[PDB]
């Protein structure tokens, strides 16, 4: 990891701080719900780079990827996962980090990527980096990102990118994201794998239930759940009494079974956040623009 630069070396370690990561690991197998996104993905993105020269006259005309979606429905963690299979660097950009002259960390981190090899830069957010003096700030970067995304063998820069908002997205930039994927909320099938992931340490129409309970919740929001109701039992129970003393390390009283109770108090604290009407968007923006 070892760059020459005309820059300020501050903003040079935000981002290996921050931006860089290489060891950072997600398995396909961790992400449920989505067999046919990763297939997508996979096409799109792995394959050509495991056979490059192959693509000739069907050579994959996507220089970048846009995941379109609600919020917490897995868009980051295939975005990881590519990373992984390819062993590249994984960049992490927010559109937030971005805004905060301003334009330099564009020209940057793209810079960055050339550098370090194979590298999957994975802009979260960029809905908002369009839409007096302040919105001049987003018009200088917005250009800068457009100039460098096509600078897209080993030499490979993949440019991944995601977004709750898609309709607030111009021609100009769509340019730029030629594939497109719908990555929706978890279906039956899929919540209930969700779980399976999330709970395989812990303690089927039981899960079911609860996956059946879900309906319309996004993969973030059932996380919390299990991580609230896994959380639940013991507290109001084995500590309710509170003795600062007695919570001593008694570890022979480790199993506390969470119940199913527990399930139906964790469900209570958030209300299902994406309304049909929201989804609405999504199913239109998809039909025309895949
Ligand atoms: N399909 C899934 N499989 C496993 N975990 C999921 C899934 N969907 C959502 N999650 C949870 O929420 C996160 C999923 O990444 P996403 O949140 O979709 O990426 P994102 O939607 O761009 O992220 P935000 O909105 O900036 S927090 C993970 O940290 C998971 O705990």
Redesign the pocket.
Known sequence: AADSTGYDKDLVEALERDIISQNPNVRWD?????VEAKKLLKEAVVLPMWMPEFFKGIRRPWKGVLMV?P???????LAKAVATECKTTFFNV?SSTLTSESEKLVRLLFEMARFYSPATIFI??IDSICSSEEHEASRRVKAELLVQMDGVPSKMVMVLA?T?FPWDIDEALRRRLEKRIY?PL?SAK?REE?LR??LRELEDVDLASIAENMEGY???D??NVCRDASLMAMRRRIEGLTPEEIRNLSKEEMHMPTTMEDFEMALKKVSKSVSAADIERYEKWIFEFG
């Open positions: 961790d992400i449920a719900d989505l979606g919020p917490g429905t897995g868009k980051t963690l927010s979260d957010e995601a709750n990555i978890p899929g969700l992931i999330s996004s993969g973030a059932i996380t």
